[PDB]
Amino acid sequence: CSAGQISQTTTQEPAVNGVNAQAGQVSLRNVHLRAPQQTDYVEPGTTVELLFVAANDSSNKLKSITSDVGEVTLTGDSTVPADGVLIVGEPDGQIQAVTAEVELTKPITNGLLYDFTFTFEDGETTVAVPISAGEQPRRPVPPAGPG
Amino acid sequence: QSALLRTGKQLFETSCVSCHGANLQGVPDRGPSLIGTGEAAVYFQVSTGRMPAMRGEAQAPSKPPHFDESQIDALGAYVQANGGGPTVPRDDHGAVAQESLIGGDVARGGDLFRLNCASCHNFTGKGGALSSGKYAPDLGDANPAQIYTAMLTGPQNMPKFSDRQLTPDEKRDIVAYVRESAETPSYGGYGLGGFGPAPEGMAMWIIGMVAAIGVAMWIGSRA
Amino acid sequence: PFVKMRPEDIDAGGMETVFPWRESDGDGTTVESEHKLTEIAMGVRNPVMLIRIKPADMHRVIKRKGQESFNFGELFAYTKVCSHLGCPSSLYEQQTYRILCPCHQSQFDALEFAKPIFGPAARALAQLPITIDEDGYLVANGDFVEPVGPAFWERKS
Amino acid sequence: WSDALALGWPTGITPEAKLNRELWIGSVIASFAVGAIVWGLIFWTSAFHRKKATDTELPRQFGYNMPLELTLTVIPFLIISVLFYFTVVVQERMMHKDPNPEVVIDVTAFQWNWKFGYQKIAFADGSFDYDGADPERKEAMTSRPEGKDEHGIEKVGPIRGMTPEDRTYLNFDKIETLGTSSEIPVLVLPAGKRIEFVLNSADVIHGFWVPEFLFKRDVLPEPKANNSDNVFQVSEIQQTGAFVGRCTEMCGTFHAMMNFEVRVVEPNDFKAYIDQRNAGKTNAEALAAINQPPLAITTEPFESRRGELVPQ
Amino acid sequence: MHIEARLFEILTAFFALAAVVYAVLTAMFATGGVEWAGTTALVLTTGLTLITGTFFRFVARRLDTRPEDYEDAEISDGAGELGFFAPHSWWPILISLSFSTAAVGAALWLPWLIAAGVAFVITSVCGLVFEYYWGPEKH
Amino acid sequence: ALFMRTELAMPGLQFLSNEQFNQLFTMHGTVMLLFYATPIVFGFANLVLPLQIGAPDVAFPRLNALSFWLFLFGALIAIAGFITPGGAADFGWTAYSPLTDAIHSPGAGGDLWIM
Amino acid sequence: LMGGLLTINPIWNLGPYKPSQVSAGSQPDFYMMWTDGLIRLWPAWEFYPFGHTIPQGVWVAVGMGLVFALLIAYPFIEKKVTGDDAHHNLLQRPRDVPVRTAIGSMAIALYLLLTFACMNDIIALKFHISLNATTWIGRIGMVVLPAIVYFVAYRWAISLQRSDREVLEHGVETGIIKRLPHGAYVELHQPLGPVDEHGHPIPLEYAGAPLPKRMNKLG
Amino acid sequence: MSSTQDRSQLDPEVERHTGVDVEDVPSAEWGWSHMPIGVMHIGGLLSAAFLLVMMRGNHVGHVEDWFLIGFAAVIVALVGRNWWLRRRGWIR
Numbered sequence A: 001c002s003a004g005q006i007s008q009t010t011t012q013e014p015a016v017n018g019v020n021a022q023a024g025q026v027s028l029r030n031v032h033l034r035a036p037q038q039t040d041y042v043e044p045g046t047t048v049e050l051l052f053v054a055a056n057d058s059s060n061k062l063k064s065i066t067s068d069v070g071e072v073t074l075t076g077d078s079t080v081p082a083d084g085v086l087i088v089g090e091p092d093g094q095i096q097a098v099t100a101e102v103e104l105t106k107p108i109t110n111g112l113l114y115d116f117t118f119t120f121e122d123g124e125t126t127v128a129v130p131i132s133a134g135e136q137p138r139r140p141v142p143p144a145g146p147g
Numbered sequence B: 001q002s003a004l005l006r007t008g009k010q011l012f013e014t015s016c017v018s019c020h021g022a023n024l025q026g027v028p029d030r031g032p033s034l035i036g037t038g039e040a041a042v043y044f045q046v047s048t049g050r051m052p053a054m055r056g057e058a059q060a061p062s063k064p065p066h067f068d069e070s071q072i073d074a075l076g077a078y079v080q081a082n083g084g085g086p087t088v089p090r091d092d093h094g095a096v097a098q099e100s101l102i103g104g105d106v107a108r109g110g111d112l113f114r115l116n117c118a119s120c121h122n123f124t125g126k127g128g129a130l131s132s133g134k135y136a137p138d139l140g141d142a143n144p145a146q147i148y149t150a151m152l153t154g155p156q157n158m159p160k161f162s163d164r165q166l167t168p169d170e171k172r173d174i175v176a177y178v179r180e181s182a183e184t185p186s187y188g189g190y191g192l193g194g195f196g197p198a199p200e201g202m203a204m205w206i207i208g209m210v211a212a213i214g215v216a217m218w219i220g221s222r223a
Numbered sequence C: 001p002f003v004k005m006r007p008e009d010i011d012a013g014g015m016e017t018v019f020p021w022r023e024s025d026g027d028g029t030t031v032e033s034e035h036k037l038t039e040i041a042m043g044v045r046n047p048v049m050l051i052r053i054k055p056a057d058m059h060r061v062i063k064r065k066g067q068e069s070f071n072f073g074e075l076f077a078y079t080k081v082c083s084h085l086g087c088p089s090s091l092y093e094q095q096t097y098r099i100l101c102p103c104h105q106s107q108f109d110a111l112e113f114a115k116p117i118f119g120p121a122a123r124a125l126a127q128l129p130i131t132i133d134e135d136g137y138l139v140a141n142g143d144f145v146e147p148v149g150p151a152f153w154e155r156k157s
Numbered sequence D: 001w002s003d004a005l006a007l008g009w010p011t012g013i014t015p016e017a018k019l020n021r022e023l024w025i026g027s028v029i030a031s032f033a034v035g036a037i038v039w040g041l042i043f044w045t046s047a048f049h050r051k052k053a054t055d056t057e058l059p060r061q062f063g064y065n066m067p068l069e070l071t072l073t074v075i076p077f078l079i080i081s082v083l084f085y086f087t088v089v090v091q092e093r094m095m096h097k098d099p100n101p102e103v104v105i106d107v108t109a110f111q112w113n114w115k116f117g118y119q120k121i122a123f124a125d126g127s128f129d130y131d132g133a134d135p136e137r138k139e140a141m142t143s144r145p146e147g148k149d150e151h152g153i154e155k156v157g158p159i160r161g162m163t164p165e166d167r168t169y170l171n172f173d174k175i176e177t178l179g180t181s182s183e184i185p186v187l188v189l190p191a192g193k194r195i196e197f198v199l200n201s202a203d204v205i206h207g208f209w210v211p212e213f214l215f216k217r218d219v220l221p222e223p224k225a226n227n228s229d230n231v232f233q234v235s236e237i238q239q240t241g242a243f244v245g246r247c248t249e250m251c252g253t254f255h256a257m258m259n260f261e262v263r264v265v266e267p268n269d270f271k272a273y274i275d276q277r278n279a280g281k282t283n284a285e286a287l288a289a290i291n292q293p294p295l296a297i298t299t300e301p302f303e304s305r306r307g308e309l310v311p312q
Numbered sequence E: 001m002h003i004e005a006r007l008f009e010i011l012t013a014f015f016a017l018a019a020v021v022y023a024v025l026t027a028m029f030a031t032g033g034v035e036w037a038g039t040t041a042l043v044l045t046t047g048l049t050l051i052t053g054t055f056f057r058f059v060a061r062r063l064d065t066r067p068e069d070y071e072d073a074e075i076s077d078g079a080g081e082l083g084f085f086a087p088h089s090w091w092p093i094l095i096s097l098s099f100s101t102a103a104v105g106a107a108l109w110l111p112w113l114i115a116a117g118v119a120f121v122i123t124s125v126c127g128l129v130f131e132y133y134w135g136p137e138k139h
Numbered sequence F: 001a002l003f004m005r006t007e008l009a010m011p012g013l014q015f016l017s018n019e020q021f022n023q024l025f026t027m028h029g030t031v032m033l034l035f036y037a038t039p040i041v042f043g044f045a046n047l048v049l050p051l052q053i054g055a056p057d058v059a060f061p062r063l064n065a066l067s068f069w070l071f072l073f074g075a076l077i078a079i080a081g082f083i084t085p086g087g088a089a090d091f092g093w094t095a096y097s098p099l100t101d102a103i104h105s106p107g108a109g110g111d112l113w114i115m
Numbered sequence G: 001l002m003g004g005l006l007t008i009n010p011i012w013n014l015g016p017y018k019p020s021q022v023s024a025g026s027q028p029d030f031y032m033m034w035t036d037g038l039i040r041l042w043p044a045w046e047f048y049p050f051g052h053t054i055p056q057g058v059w060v061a062v063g064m065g066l067v068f069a070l071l072i073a074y075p076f077i078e079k080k081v082t083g084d085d086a087h088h089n090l091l092q093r094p095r096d097v098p099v100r101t102a103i104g105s106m107a108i109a110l111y112l113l114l115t116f117a118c119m120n121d122i123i124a125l126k127f128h129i130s131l132n133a134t135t136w137i138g139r140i141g142m143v144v145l146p147a148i149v150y151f152v153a154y155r156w157a158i159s160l161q162r163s164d165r166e167v168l169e170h171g172v173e174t175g176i177i178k179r180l181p182h183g184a185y186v187e188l189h190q191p192l193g194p195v196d197e198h199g200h201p202i203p204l205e206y207a208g209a210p211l212p213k214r215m216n217k218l219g
Numbered sequence H: 001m002s003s004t005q006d007r008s009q010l011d012p013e014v015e016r017h018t019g020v021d022v023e024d025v026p027s028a029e030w031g032w033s034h035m036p037i038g039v040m041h042i043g044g045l046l047s048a049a050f051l052l053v054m055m056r057g058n059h060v061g062h063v064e065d066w067f068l069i070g071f072a073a074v075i076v077a078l079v080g081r082n083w084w085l086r087r088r089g090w091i092r
């Protein structure tokens, strides 16, 4: 009975940090926020970078503003997807051109979900983007004195 | 090398884009997304053989590998260039490091394998059952780089024990344990599996107790 | 043996076993420690799995009463000691989100609250509240709201 | 009358298919001319009932009629002999094997979708000095000088010296009409040329079966090694438009999801197709450049979902 | 007997004819060469009917007309004592359980179950073949 | 077959999945060819062939029980792919080899089908 | 031989007991695998009285107290049911007492079910079955498979009776002779007791003994 | 032929009157040989009632409840057929 119809394999998510978004005719996969998280929250004014791909299911290429909170800037090399990808920047170890990044003006921490609204030529989607890092291992905790 | 990325693309187009959409996306309810999983994920999922698969079932099982090491680097670097995430650890030759991964400790690896995951598999790394048809596999036929990239990017139903959840010292330490727990012989007899009492029962009955009743019917008569 | 924890350590689709360490009982380098410190490792009702649900699957979650703010974004903390007969339910399935126990194979739903999907258990496996500390470390936001181990007579009123 | 008597073919679009359909019409005339007289024999020997006036007296009781047996062992042999001669004279016209084709399509056929090649074009009208690429055919000939042991073996490979996971049969091309799981692969072909099809499959046997070619072939994995003349020419294609193409072996699960199209365009539309694709455009853009609807028109790219009771 | 030797001689003539004509028609007329996969199957189905027909011809020459096989033979001409048939026996069900355990060890690749099923095959095959040869218990 | 034919009654995948259908015609083709026809061609033999040739019993009267019980316990362990979670053989009755080698259709049901 | 040649309880492969780490098997020794297999199969029925809790584990604490109270006190149970108020020294062959053999085979197969669904985990591991499916197979099997094995056991004991109550009315079976003047086939039965003047002997009475069914086992 | 006869005087016994006759089962005096048949009817019916109670539990897979309905309806059908045939004396 486990064979086909509601399968435990094709009804799955990839083991990766950022969310997906099938809606709005732009295939929007692995959107996350690369944010080196120094304290409780990352303080306002810190520039932290938003990452995704924007695959096309055909051409939707516009990337109007895509801003909910944090003053999202973009790059003019944005009219890429004609049944193709839009790789934003290097997420994590992508060694090989759109520096999408936010100037927070709100304290954000890792482990939360933050509603970003990606608007396109076809529509907009709220994604509840996470904070991610494929960073180096954890910064060294101070070893506690016994007692 | 860009020709290596092109080789990864040539193998990508003619094996999977029925279930990954050829923009490294996810074909909905037929195959999930693939960016961000990375070269480590593709090394474990094709070097074991699993993901060039043939049905979406309870879980996609192990199988012979569909590509070789001269092409896994191409396919994993292609998925890391399209996406980007964990990478497979490599030695001073540029090839995939498989022997430099066994850590210098085993007992820490024993306790850490035992705490963090041996709930699912077994003590020595034999398989274990899972919820609805899915199952943990045996760790005996497991390349150490596949073990590191198995815990590094968790394929199916296993948690991805990340670079920050378990440190690479700890992950080298776990693959030091499992390559000397599924490799060391069973001290003191045949190893009736790795999990104890049910094979020991079934080998009590048909090996020991059937021989006992056979001796008892050779000695006593019947009337 | 106990390293303090951040949310950036565990990532999406990850079980991780946490223990109630404190700032008082520090490293295991003193004999007044390793007995407030192995007490944590020997006490039955201590282990808690720290679930990091993939944030594409946060719309499938439905919390229960008195327990709506016991997440931390997508960090859940369900106990490891199961509902009935107290084995650690340290099997965890991402992409189906089921805390499976080994001793009697009783699933629990990681999404909603650890209600038993299937098995011989009939009670919600307990959930621990989470906040981050000053300096950004994962701490418990109090005690469990229910007794955490296996069931017995004096319970549920 | 000619379509309903032919047990409902699709009518031919190549002279291969026209002549094959004529032989099927003649052969169902032969099969119904056998079955009509033999159903006449059965439904007229069901006029030999047990008669009510038939007393306790058995029938003719004969058996063992040698001259009648010689006649009806000679006449089905004549039927199958004339059908075998017409079969062989149409078997000559299935691959004429012209060394001078007009457009060669490298139909490779991977796990659960297709990819069409355009390996070589050469018009007898005079156009299209176009060829195939071939830097992509790199091997997996595992000629490593030493394996797990330390000396002597220099192990070369499993099959013919190479690994099974090899891909050296698998020829590629600059132009590639790749078929994704949400866009059906659209081969387009010039009307009235000599269209060669060289067939390879990356993984597993299935079938290049256009219904209206009235012909198929199986994409065997390494067909040169497996004695399989995979290649076949199609003599012309008269009728333009779009034609469905199915998949006609067993591939594994997503097997009805392997449809393609062979859209037959005019030769100047073929000019404006590839000369609006050498300047690199995808399939929908190249079909929009020749005033023709870009998506697959005779088959929709049906559901990536799994059922009508899966929750989306 | 006579007619089984003639029967498998007819099958031997046709199988040898088909084997040699398939070998010499796939030597030419084929794409690469001899098919080698129905050719040797035809050569050894010729071998099958060679073994059966050669043994039946060996028997049919070293025999008279059998009082069974003789046309116009009364029943009292061949009414003697036939050989032993087995009565009731519960070993074939154990043969099948043993060979099925070995097969599901060879399907679900369980080498312990392969070895145990082969051990049950040996035990049950012994129980079948010794069934009418165990002497009484000597006490 | 009635499950397959409920499935083909409408162009959707309305009743059961793709993979269950590919298991469905395969196990169906076997338990109509190799587990329905192939046994009954000796089942009528064990009915009436010793009756027709004047034989007291069939010639190897334990090995006929062995034939029947090996048949039934090959048939049950070939139907036993349906107990498996990925199900039985999705490749056809024809079972062509680039689809049956363990890279392709890797489940346990094909192995149970084979043995 | 099996203490040397076969490993058992490899406690070094296992760990020290720490209450935060488990195996996947976690199964007891086999003579107690029917107990928590009964935990693995009892379908999560808990009660909640006024401010308290009866959990699942009460049931098997009843259930192990149930089966033992049927296994200690069985001879008094069937002394009440049957009416065996007699000093019995001779045994009865287990075919000669079909409902008691069938109740016993219910208990044997119920034990085999509760055990064979206590390695539920490793069965669903190796013999590739859904784990939920094999514990439902056990959970229905403990209700329907004692009924199936009761039917098969009772009628199989009666047919084992009839199989050695026709070896007395007839002989013991051997090879076949044909009858001489006509075409017949008799099995040439060899009688066990005194014979009459014709093709049938004096049929013996049953005596609770294993009667030989092969002339092989005779001289 | 190398065998002796067998003669066993047991303590033969309800006392040889109510139960099963010695031609229904070929040895009824040699042991207990008849369960009263209301016990197995109510045992089957209570088995099917238990399989129907087994829906109540931790449960999301309703593909199982069709197996429980199926194995309960089979047992209810067998018990009802068997009781109906004894109510009519094994007819149809």
Ligand SMILES: CC(C)=CCC/C(C)=C/CC/C(C)=C\CC/C(C)=C/CC/C(C)=C/CC/C(C)=C/CC/C(C)=C\CC/C(C)=C/CC/C(C)=C/CC1=C(C)C(=O)c2ccccc2C1=O
Pocket: B198, B201, B202, B205, B206, B209, B210, B213, G030, G031, G034, G067, G070, G071, G074, G103, G104, G105, G107, G108, G110, G111, G112, G115
């Ligand atoms: C005789 C019977 C128990 C009647 C008692 C009276 C009855 C009414 C009391 C109530 C019992 C009912 C209500 C509940 C059942 C619970 C059950 C009886 C628990 C008590 C423990 C005990 C008495 C169990 C029953 C006795 C036991 C099953 C007898 C063994 C079976 C036979 C008759 C012996 C010969 C078998 C021997 C030759 C070996 C053959 C090989 C076969 C395959 C062994 C089967 C087998 C077994 C039996 C395992 O235990 C086992 C454990 C772990 C792994 C595998 C196996 C395994 O394969």
Ligand SMILES: CCCCCCCCCCCCCCCC(=O)O[C@H](COC(=O)CCCCCCC[C@@H](C)CCCCCCCCC)COP(=O)(O)O[C@H]1[C@H](O)[C@H](O)[C@H](O)[C@@H](O)[C@@H]1O
Pocket: B125, B126, B138, B139, B140, B182, B183, B184, B185, B186, B189, B190, B191, B192, B193, B194, B202, B203, B206, B207, E101, E111, E112, E113, E115, E116, E117, G004, G005, G006
């Ligand atoms: C005579 C002189 C004295 C010498 C001493 C003799 C005593 C034996 C002990 C000596 C050392 C041998 C033990 C080896 C060490 C050892 O443990 O034995 C393993 C177990 O493996 C297997 O099963 C494969 C073995 C198959 C052989 C036949 C199976 C035995 C059968 C007969 C047992 C019967 C049981 C009852 C059947 C039930 C009846 C059912 C109806 C095999 O190791 P290996 O194959 O190499 O690899 C492992 C991987 O199997 C493993 O999956 C992997 O996970 C790793 O463990 C890896 O190390």
Ligand SMILES: CCCCCCCCCCCCCCCC(=O)O[C@H](COC(=O)CCCCCCC[C@@H](C)CCCCCCCCC)COP(=O)(O)O[C@H]1[C@H](O)[C@H](O)[C@H](O)[C@@H](O)[C@@H]1O
Pocket: C153, C154, C155, G049, G050, G052
């Ligand atoms: C010699 C006779 C054999 C009996 C042996 C054992 C009986 C010993 C009784 C001695 C103590 C009597 C009351 C004082 C001892 C006491 O105060 O506690 C009680 C502790 O007695 C128990 O263990 C068991 C009984 C509980 C009281 C009532 C039980 C019997 C009745 C009520 C049940 C039958 C009717 C209901 C349904 C029946 C079955 C199905 C219909 C109840 O626990 P609890 O209520 O959870 O109270 C908590 C504080 O303990 C803690 O400090 C504090 O933290 C609190 O928060 C709380 O946790």
Ligand SMILES: CCCCCCCCCCCCCCCC(=O)O[C@H](COC(=O)CCCCCCC[C@@H](C)CCCCCCCCC)COP(=O)(O)O[C@H]1[C@H](O)[C@H](O)[C@H](O)[C@@H](O)[C@@H]1O
Pocket: A001, A002, A003, A005, A006, A007, A008, B131, B132, B133, F082, F083, F085, G109, G112, G113, G116, G130, G131, G132, G133, G134, G136, G137, G138, G140, G141, G144, G145, G148, H061, H062, H063, H064, H067
């Ligand atoms: C030694 C030889 C032994 C031979 C025994 C052979 C077994 C007999 C037949 C067994 C049929 C098994 C069919 C199971 C097929 C199956 O997987 O169904 C599952 C649950 O079904 C079931 O277990 C119900 C079937 C219960 C069978 C009735 C038991 C009969 C007894 C008599 C047999 C006991 C034998 C024990 C032998 C012990 C020795 C005794 C001497 C649904 O749950 P699940 O798959 O996890 O969840 C789904 C997602 O997977 C899926 O994606 C989604 O779509 C949803 O469907 C979701 O619910």
Ligand code: HEC
Pocket: A009, A010, A012, A013, A014, A015, A016, B011, B012, B015, B016, B019, B020, B030, B031, B032, B033, B034, B037, B041, B042, B045, B046, B051, B052, B053, B054, B055, B056, B060, B075, B153, B154, B155, B156, B157, D111
């Ligand atoms: C069955 C068709 C299919 C085949 C062929 C295929 N994929 Fe898979 N892919 C899937 C399915 C189904 C999964 C589900 C398993 C999962 O995601 O946990 C998946 C998941 C993956 C994963 C794991 C993702 C993660 O987050 O862990 C990787 C890596 C992957 N595929 C890569 C590949 C590569 C590389 C190829 C070779 C070009 C390939 N696949 C071929 C469909 C396929």
Ligand code: HEC
Pocket: B048, B050, B059, B060, B061, B062, B113, B116, B117, B120, B121, B130, B134, B135, B136, B137, B138, B139, B141, B142, B146, B147, B148, B150, B151, B155, B156, B157, B158, B159, B161, B174, C091, C092, C093
């Ligand atoms: C459910 C919890 C789960 C836990 C936790 C888990 N595994 Fe996995 N493991 C699985 C499953 C399921 C697979 C199979 C995934 C697949 O087939 O795509 C697997 C695959 C593997 C494999 C591949 C086996 C092979 O034949 O190639 C290895 C090795 C492995 N795991 C080891 C580990 C390691 C190392 C850890 C971390 C210390 C771990 N397991 C934790 C369930 C788990």
Ligand SMILES: *C[C@@H](COC(=O)CCCCCCCCCCCCCCC)OC(=O)CCCCCCCC[C@@H](C)CCCCCCCC
Pocket: A001, A002, F076, F077, F079, F080, F082, F083, H063, H066, H067, H070, H071, H074
């Ligand atoms: C996905 C599931 C389909 O399940 C559903 O969707 C609906 C559930 C169907 C309801 C079940 C009704 C059955 C009633 C039982 C009546 C049986 C006859 C009398 C028995 C007392 O897919 C499946 O689960 C399909 C189920 C797989 C069936 C396997 C067939 C048996 C295989 C064999 C290994 C079993 C061992 C022996 C069986 C008996 C042998 C006799 C010779």
Ligand SMILES: *C(=O)CCCCCCCCCCCCCCC
Pocket: A001, A002, A003, A004, F003, F020, F023, F024, F082, F083, F084, F085, F086, F087, F088
């Ligand atoms: C679960 O993964 C199985 C997938 C395929 C299930 C299809 C079931 C079709 C019917 C099988 C019938 C078997 C015997 C039933 C007896 C009535």
Ligand code: FES
Pocket: C082, C083, C084, C085, C086, C087, C088, C089, C101, C102, C103, C104, C105, C106, C119, C120, C121
């Ligand atoms: S012991 Fe884990 S739920 Fe019963």
Ligand SMILES: [Cu+2]
Pocket: D112, D206, D207, D247, D248, D249, D250, D251, D252, D254, D255, D258
């Ligand atoms: Cu196909």
